Structure formats: structure tokens, C-alpha cells
């Protein structure tokens, strides 16, 4: 049972009541490209659908909403709201009437039923909602055997909602953007249907073709959602496509949801990890790290931090990372507490014991370019620590105290250190003197008053962001 | 109760540092186990220390004393349920039931904590409770209950005003602070050394004078250092008893080189034997020597580690990696050198180093409101 | 131990005593901004509370 009937009857009609009944006020709110006040609310409740009960998580009687609502998908004279109220009163097919299950068997002619019924009077969120919400809340069944093509077929009628989206209603619909919100989400379900066993070969030239119909003319959030797809498939898939960005780099005019812009800067900064652009990556991956604070308590912020701080370890120096300790992280040993301990020590045997010992988890790293200059980061951490400590140091001290076997090898490390501008050392190449020294003029004569155009350029930028922020009401 | 079984938790700290022996376990494990119906001081160190061969004539006569004590609980609360007084059950049974927490396990949570906490309005009985989460934070060496007695305490910190016992809240909050690396609040909260003369939760008040001088010797800048530990009038007697403690302040204030380490050797020999300080005898004493090199290395500029190493003892290479880990430790900015050997100090943070933290905050916290500033539209 | 800003110079002679004590510009400003960040924290619960 008696507790399974009342709950989806309540929350389900609370969903489409505000969804259809409010989106009616949205598209009848003739200029609503930014309101969408039950579109984004509805997607907030669909992210709540994947947590909670679905359309019908086969809820112990028959799973009867699917043979209920998509039948008579017709928005005529407003007694069709009473057709949906008949679809409230018929929710006791599980309780009162003859229980008839039609999931995975009649769901394909049910997908034909928005075409089998009469004309959709320009409220496509209900119909593309009926093209996503049946089978994408059935991804949680996880068999993915002959229903890959079923969920894909629901996305084919979503592609019919692309035909009726950007191939119909040629006068300024502005539900096209909300269908780019829903369409982008079920493109992540193209990942969650295709990418379990194949790659999205349709959405290669249809990635760029949905980008083509979402380039300039009515583009909003399709740019960097299709570029999150473009950026995310093409990392496990082979690279140089991020160089295919580089001739046509177009980022948002205005930033989206801070989760999306956060993870987007995490994706492209994670490209600059393997591109080894160390200057921009620390601040855009710092920005991306701090910009996504909401996560599930078992992780994905430790995934974002773990796969974030590797090239930050490869900067040559690093701070001691973040500032908010996590114990399930400590159980999973994701970002290598012991290895960054081997970084701030000048150790090599326990260092390569971490390297050799944990290689099954270095598989979970997948970024083996870390070690090839990270052993070099051990030796540059050593010469940076000792050179930073001593005013003068010599090759007799460091060249065999750090067992570099010879003067000239340390003269090559200091050749690369002066080449990196790390030390202001000098080497007398006659007797074997590193006649190292420390430079002068640390005072605020010139350098901070030069820096104040960066500090105050930053400050005037936040002035103008505050002004443009004031421009909205 | 407080001080005998509190001292038996100090004997659990005697179980703590000598681990290789089981004789100083069993001697006053037995001597603490035979007195005053103490089931728990051989129960948790039955679980932790050496076991018992038998306990029939040894200690089951004391579970028989727990049976006599328990059957006169079964006299007392039934004699107190007839009476209608100040909740005679929970008072006349809060006494012997806090004593039950002295006998056995943490059942004095239910038969102490809420037992008078649900009854009283004065902070005396609940403050005895707070003192008992303190002492069970000395038995188990808690992290929880020595915060939860501050949690129950702040319900009655909002009203009060008292001389001894609320300054004892300042004391044991001090011990909670300096139980981990939190240092100045213990010293400042101990600094009213007058009002804490003798209550039945104290150890030696002279040892309280030692503990406030150990936590008060740093976090006290040199005018305040001489103003407290030297210019203090009434402190001069209770450090005049222990001369090496009096010598320790006078050796540090003399600013020599070797008596830093003779004196520091004395304070090392103390700073093993102190409970909830024996996890913390590294950073305290490098805090000592970073205070010493801080106060000693600032004034000279024609400084050389030859002239240092002459009067330290030997510091030719013996302070080399020491001061290299000190400059390399992030603090103590001077310039250690090759055999040219000139140590060069830094700014007093009048001009240059001050010009950082404004943008350290105006990037970070202002960037947090840059993100919340970007929570307008989506 | 004591001081009169008599900083050690082995090779000058004057053992130069000098200072610039009034720099209360950055003193009072930094002391304000430390409190200002606490005021912005005092606004953060209003900000994060009023939205969602």
C-alpha cells in the first residue's frame, strides 16, 4: 504494498503539472529565452528522478505510467488537461484495474504514439520529455542488451524532436534552447548508450552537425555542451582533435551553470596537462577545482582533484596541494600522499618503490609522462631546496652529496637551472668551483609597482564584472 | 573522586611510553587494581596491559564489592523513590553512580550525564559531569568527550561568573588546546594562576605552575616574556622551588649558545613524561630553538657559523642540516653559506612582506564571492 | 637583547641607526581588510542563503 501507489502519483503529477502547466506560461510568455522557470526546475527534478523513483522503477505492481501518458499525446482544447487528469485517475490500473505491463515491448509503438496521436501544438518539452524520460531512466537497469537500440530509438524520436525543433516553428520558438538543455543531456545519454560498447559515430559528424545547427544563429549552451562532448570523447578516443579546436576556438559569450563552466575548464585544463602548458593550467584547474564544490560524498571531487594535481606536481615545485582532508580518499589512495612525500623528499629508492609497487594504480593514473620528468622533479627539488637554502654552494657539496657522480653533471643541472632562471649561480670551471651567489634588490623599488597593474587590472576587471552584474535587473 | 583514578589514567600514560616493559605495567596495575572497587582500571588494562592469571580471590572479591555496592544501590534508589526531595534518586544515586563510572565502564554516561543534567539548574553538578568527560578523556584519551564537555559546558558559559571553577574551565580548555598544536590559548587561559589554588580536581599546583610556564614560555614576545616569567612577583616563589625550571627561563633569557641545549636538555627530560604532550615533543622544542635563533640571529649581520659553533659546542656540520632544514622549513630567513660563511638576515616586515596578504585574501575569499557572484543567472 | 636600531656593520663605522616608523598607511589598511574579509564572510550566509 500500500505505500508504493501514493508516492509516484503525487510526485509525478507534481512534475508534469508545473512542467506542462508552467511551460505553457513559458512559451506563452512570448519572450522567454532566460526565464525557463520550470524547464531548469524540471531538469533539477530529473536529476532528482535519477536518484528517486523513475517514471516507474517497475514499482512492484505493473509499471503503468508508460502505457498511460504517451497515449493520447494531444494538447487540444483544454479538456486535454483533463485527459492528463484521466491519466491521474487511471494510475489505479496498478491498484484497481487490470494490471497491464507494456515496458520494453510496447514502448516502441508508444514512441510512435506522439506521431500516432494528433498535432503537437508547439510544446515540445512534453514530447521530447517523452523521448528521454521513458528509457533514459531505464539506463539504471544496466543490462544494455537489445535495449541499447531501444534507448537509442527513443533518441531517434528525440531526433524527430530535432526535426520538429529546428526544422519546424520558423518564428523564434525559444524552446529550442531548452531543448538544447534536454538534448545535451540525452547526448550524454548517447554517451551512456553508445559508449558502453561502441563510439558515437553518428555524433561525430552529428556532433559537428548539431554544432552546425547550433553554431551562431540560435546557439545557447550547445557550444560548450557539444564541446564538452567534443572534449570528453576525444581524450579516451585519440588526440589532435584538441588541436582541431585550436583553429576554431569558440568559448561561451556568457558562462553557463557554474558546474558546467567549472567542469569545462577542468576538461580543457586537463588537456593543457598533456599539452604541458604549466602557466595557464594551474589557474584554470585551480579555478575548476574551487568552482565545483557540490559532489557525492564518496567522491568525484577527489577524482577532479586527483587527476587535477598531477602536472601541478610536475611544475617543478608544488604547494602541499588542497586544504580539506578526506578519509575515503585516504582509503582509495588516489592522488598519492606517499608519492608527493617522495617528491618533497629528495629520495629515489622509496620513490621508485612507489613507482614500481603501485603500477596497477598507475594504470588508473594513465598519465605515465608524470614519472619521466618527475624523477627529474626529484632531482630539481633537491637542487632547488639546497640552492634555495645556501647562499653559496659548490659542486663538492651538492654534486656528490646528491651523488651526481661528477662536477659537470651538476654543472648541467645548474645549466638547466640558470636556463630555467632558478638560481643566480656561477661556476668557475678551472678548479671545480660552483662559485654560486644570490642576487640583490629584493626591495619594492620597481617590481610591486609594476605588479599593481596586474593587481589593479584584476580589480578593475572585478569592478566591471560587478557593473555588468548590476545590469541584469 | 577525581584525582586518584585520574592518576590511574596517568598510570595509563605509564602504560603509554614504556611499552617494552610489563613490570611497571603490572606493579601499580595491581596496586591500582586492588583499591577502591576499581573494576575498569584492571578491565581496560586487562584488555590492553598484561592479563590476569585468575581473579577469584584477586579481583572477584572486588566484583563482590561491586555486588555489595550495587545491592546498596538497590537499597538506595528504592529508599529514595519514597522520598520526594531534590530528585533524591538521581542525587543520592548520582554520587554512587558517578562512583559507578569510577568502578566500571562508561555507563556513567547514562547514570551520570543526563542523570543530573536532566535535573539541575546550577552548574556544579553538570560541571562535575564536564570534569568527568575530562577524566574519561584522560582514561581513553578521547577526542570526542573532551569536546562534548565543552559542548555541555557552553550551555552554562552563557551565564555565570566565578573565580576558581570557571577559570578551571579555562584550564582544561587550555589542556584541550595544547593537547594538539594549539599553544597561546592554553598559556593565556592559564595566565590567571592565582584563582586556581586548590580544588579536588588538581594535581600539584606547583606542577600547574610548571605546566603554565612550559606553555607560556613561547607565545610571549620578549617584553611580555620578561614581563611575565621574570617580572612576575608571585610566580618567583613557585618557580623558586624547582631551580632548573627557574634556570631554564634564565638560560634562555641569558641568550647563550650551549646552556640553550643544557637547559633544553632538561626540558627535553621533562617533555617525555607529560601526558597529551608526549605526542607533541618535536614542534614544541624546535619552536624553542626557532625562538632562540630568531631572537639571536636578528641583531648580528656580520655573523658566522664559526663564531656560532665555537660557543654552541660543535656546530660545524652539526647545525648545518639543522639550520638548512630551518631556512628550508619555511621560516627563519637568513643566508646559510659555503665557507665564505656570512649569515645575512632579512626585513622586519615593515615595508615589503606586508604587501602580500591583502591580495592573498582578495584573490581567495573575494574569488569565492566571484563564484557566488556568478550565481546570478545559471 | 635591547635595541636602539644600532644595526651591525663591520665595515662602516657609523653603525647606522635609521628607520621609517610612520608607515601606518598599509598598517591601518591591512587591519581593515582583515576585518573586511570577515565582513564578506558575514555576508556569505546571507548570499548563499537567499538564493537556494
Amino acid at each position: 504494498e500500500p505505500p508504493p501507489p501514493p508516492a509516484p502519483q503525487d510526485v509525478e503529477m507534481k512534475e508534469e503539472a508545473a512542467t506542462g502547466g508552467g511551460s505553457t506560461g513559458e512559451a506563452d510568455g512570448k519572450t522567454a529565452a532566460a526565464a525557463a522557470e520550470h524547464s531548469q526546475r524540471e531538469l533539477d527534478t530529473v536529476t532528482l528522478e535519477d536518484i528517486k523513483e523513475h517514471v516507474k522503477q517497475l514499482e512492484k505492481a505493473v509499471s503503468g505510467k508508460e502505457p498511460r501518458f504517451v497515449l493520447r499525446a494531444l494538447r487540444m482544447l483544454p479538456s486535454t488537461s483533463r485527459r492528463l487528469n484521466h491519466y491521474v485517475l487511471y494510475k489505479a490500473v496498478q491498484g484497481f484495474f487490470t494490471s497491464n505491463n507494456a515496458t520494453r515491448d510496447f514502448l516502441l509503438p508508444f514512441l510512435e504514439e506522439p506521431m500516432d496521436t494528433e498535432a503537437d501544438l508547439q510544446f515540445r518539452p512534453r514530447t521530447g520529455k517523452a523521448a528521454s524520460t521513458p528509457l533514459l531512466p531505464e539506463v539504471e537497469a544496466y543490462l544494455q542488451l537489445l535495449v541499447v537500440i531501444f534507448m537509442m530509438n527513443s533518441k531517434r524520436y528525440k531526433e524527430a524532436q530535432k526535426i520538429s525543433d529546428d526544422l519546424m516553428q520558423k518564428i523564434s520558438t525559444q524552446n529550442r534552447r531548452a531543448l538544447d538543455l534536454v538534448a545535451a543531456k540525452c547526448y550524454y545519454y548517447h554517451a551512456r548508450v553508445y559508449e558502453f560498447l561502441d563510439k558515437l559515430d553518428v555524433v561525430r559528424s552529428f556532433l559537428h552537425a548539431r554544432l552546425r545547427t547550433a553554431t551562431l544563429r540560435h546557439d545557447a549552451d550547445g557550444q560548450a555542451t557539444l564541446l564538452n562532448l567534443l572534449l570528453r570523447n576525444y581524450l579516451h578516443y585519440s588526440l589532435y582533435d584538441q588541436a582541431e579546436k585550436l583553429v576554431s576556438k569558440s568559448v561561451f559569450p556568457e558562462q553557463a551553470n557554474n558546474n558546467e563552466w567549472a567542469r569545462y575548464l577542468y576538461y580543457t585544463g586537463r588537456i593543457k596537462a598533456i599539452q604541458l602548458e604549466y602557466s595557464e593550467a594551474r589557474r584554470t584547474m585551480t579555478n575548476a577545482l574551487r568552482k565545483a564544490p557540490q559532489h557525492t560524498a564518496v567522491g568525484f571531487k577527489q577524482t577532479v582533484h586527483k587527476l587535477l594535481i598531477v602536472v601541478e606536481l610536475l611544475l617543478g615545485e608544488i604547494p602541499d596541494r588542497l586544504q580539506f582532508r578526506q578519509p575515503s580518499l585516504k582509503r582509495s589512495l588516489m592522488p598519492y600522499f606517499l608519492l608527493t612525500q617522495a617528491v618533497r623528499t629528495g629520495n629515489l629508492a622509496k620513490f621508485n618503490q612507489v613507482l614500481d609497487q603501485f603500477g596497477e594504480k598507475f594504470q588508473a593514473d594513465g598519465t605515465y609522462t608524470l614519472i619521466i620528468r618527475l624523477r627529474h622533479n626529484v632531482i630539481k627539488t633537491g637542487v632547488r631546496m639546497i640552492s634555495l637554502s645556501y647562499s653559496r654552494i659548490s659542486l663538492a657539496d651538492i654534486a656528490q652529496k646528491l651523488q651526481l657522480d661528477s662536477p659537470e653533471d651538476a654543472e648541467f643541472i645548474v645549466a638547466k637551472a640558470i636556463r630555467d632562471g632558478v638560481i643566480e649561480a656561477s661556476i668557475n670551471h678551472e678548479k671545480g668551483y660552483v662559485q654560486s651567489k644570490e642576487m640583490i634588490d629584493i626591495y619594492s623599488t620597481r617590481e610591486p609597482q609594476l605588479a599593481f597593474h596586474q593587481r589593479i587590472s584584476f580589480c578593475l576587471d572585478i569592478h566591471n564584472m560587478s557593473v555588468k552584474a548590476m545590469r541584469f535587473p | 573522586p577525581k584525582n586518584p583514578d585520574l592518576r590511574i589514567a596517568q598510570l595509563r600514560f605509564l602504560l603509554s611510553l614504556p611499552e617494552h616493559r610489563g613490570d611497571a605495567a603490572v606493579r601499580d596495575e595491581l596496586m591500582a587494581a586492588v583499591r577502591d572497587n576499581n573494576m575498569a582500571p584492571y578491565y581496560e588494562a586487562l584488555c590492553k596491559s598484561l592479563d590476569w592469571q585468575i581473579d577469584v580471590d584477586l579481583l572477584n572479591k572486588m566484583k563482590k564489592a561491586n555486588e555489595d555496592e550495587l545491592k546498596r544501590l538497590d537499597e538506595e534508589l528504592e529508599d529514595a523513590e519514597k522520598n520526594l526531595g531534590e530528585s533524591e534518586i538521581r542525587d543520592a544515586m548520582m554520587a554512587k553512580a558517578e562512583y559507578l563510572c569510577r568502578i566500571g565502564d562508561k555507563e556513567g554516561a547514562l547514570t551520570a550525564f543526563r542523570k543530573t543534567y536532566d535535573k539541575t539548574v546550577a552548574l556544579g553538578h553538570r560541571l562535575d559531569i564536564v570534569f568527568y568527560l575530562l577524566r574519561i578523556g584522560l582514561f581513553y584519551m578521547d577526542n570526542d568527550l573532551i569536546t562534548r564537555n565543552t559542548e555541555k559546558a557552553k550551555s552554562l558559559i552563557e551565564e555565570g561568573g566565578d573565580w576558581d571553577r570557571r577559570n578551571r574551565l579555562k584550564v582544561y580548555q587550555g589542556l584541550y588546546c595544547v593537547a594538539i598544536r594549539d599553544f597561546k590559548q592554553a598559556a593565556e587561559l592559564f595566565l590567571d594562576t592565582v584563582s586556581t589554588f586548590t580544588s579536588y580536581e588538581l594535581m600539584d599546583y606547583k606542577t600547574f605552575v610548571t605546566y603554565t610556564v612550559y606553555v607560556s614560555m613561547i607565545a610571549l614576545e620578549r617584553p611580555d616574556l620578561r614581563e611575565k616569567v621574570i617580572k612576575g612577583a608571585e610566580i618567583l616563589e613557585v618557580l623558586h622551588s624547582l631551580p632548573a625550571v627557574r634556570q631554564y627561563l634564565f638560560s634562555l633569557y641569558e641568550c647563550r649558545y650551549s646552556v640553550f641545549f643544557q637547559s633544553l636538555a632538561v626540558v627535553e627530560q621533562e617533555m617525555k613524561k607529560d601526558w597529551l604532550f608526549a605526542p607533541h615533543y618535536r614542534y614544541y622544542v624546535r619552536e624553542m630553538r626557532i625562538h632562540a635563533y630568531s631572537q639571536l640571529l636578528e641583531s648580528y649581520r656580520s655573523l658566522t657559523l664559526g663564531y656560532m659553533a665555537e660557543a654552541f659546542g660543535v656546530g660545524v656540520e652539526f647545525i648545518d642540516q639543522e639550520l638548512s632544514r630551518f631556512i628550508a622549513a619555511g621560516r627563519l630567513h637568513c643566508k646559510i653559506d659555503k665557507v665564505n660563511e656570512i649569515v645575512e638576515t632579512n626585513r622586519p616586515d615593515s615595508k615589503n612582506w606586508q604587501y602580500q596578504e591583502t591580495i592573498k585574501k582578495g584573490d581567495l575569499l573575494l574569488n569565492r564571492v566571484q563564484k557566488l557572484s556568478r550565481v546570478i543567472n545559471m | 637583547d635591547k635595541k636602539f636600531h644600532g644595526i651591525l656593520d663591520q665595515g662602516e663605522g657609523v653603525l647606522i641607526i635609521f628607520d621609517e616608523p610612520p608607515v601606518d598607511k598599509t598598517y591601518e589598511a591591512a587591519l581593515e581588510t582583515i576585518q573586511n574579509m570577515s565582513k564578506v564572510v558575514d555576508s556569505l550566509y546571507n548570499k548563499a542563503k537567499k538564493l537556494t
Binding site: 610591486p448 609597482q449 599593481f452 593587481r455 589593479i456 580589480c459 578593475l460 572585478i462 569592478h463 560587478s466 557593473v467 552584474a469 548590476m470 541584469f472 535587473p473 | 604587501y355 591583502t358 591580495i359 582578495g362 573575494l366 564571492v369 557566488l372 557572484s373 546570478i376 | 598607511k25 598599509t26 589598511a29 581593515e32 581588510t33 573586511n36 565582513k39 564578506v40 555576508s43 546571507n46 548570499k47 537567499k50 538564493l51
Partner: peptide, 30 residues
């Protein structure tokens, strides 16, 4: 120095009431 410190505090002037009155007028419009 006065431009650096003081104009950073000018940012600290505009930002607070600009954000607070901004989202008051934004999400209290309806």
C-alpha cells in the same frame, strides 16, 4: 601604493552592495 591598496578597497566598496542589491533586485523581482 595608494592606487594598489586603496583601489583594491574601491573594489571592496563596489562589490558588496553591488552583489547584495543586485540579487535582491534580481530574484526579488518576481
Amino acid at each position: 601604493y595608494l592606487a594598489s591598496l586603496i583601489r583594491s578597497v574601491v573594489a571592496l566598496h563596489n562589490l558588496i552592495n553591488n552583489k547584495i542589491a543586485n540579487r535582491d533586485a534580481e530574484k526579488k523581482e518576481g
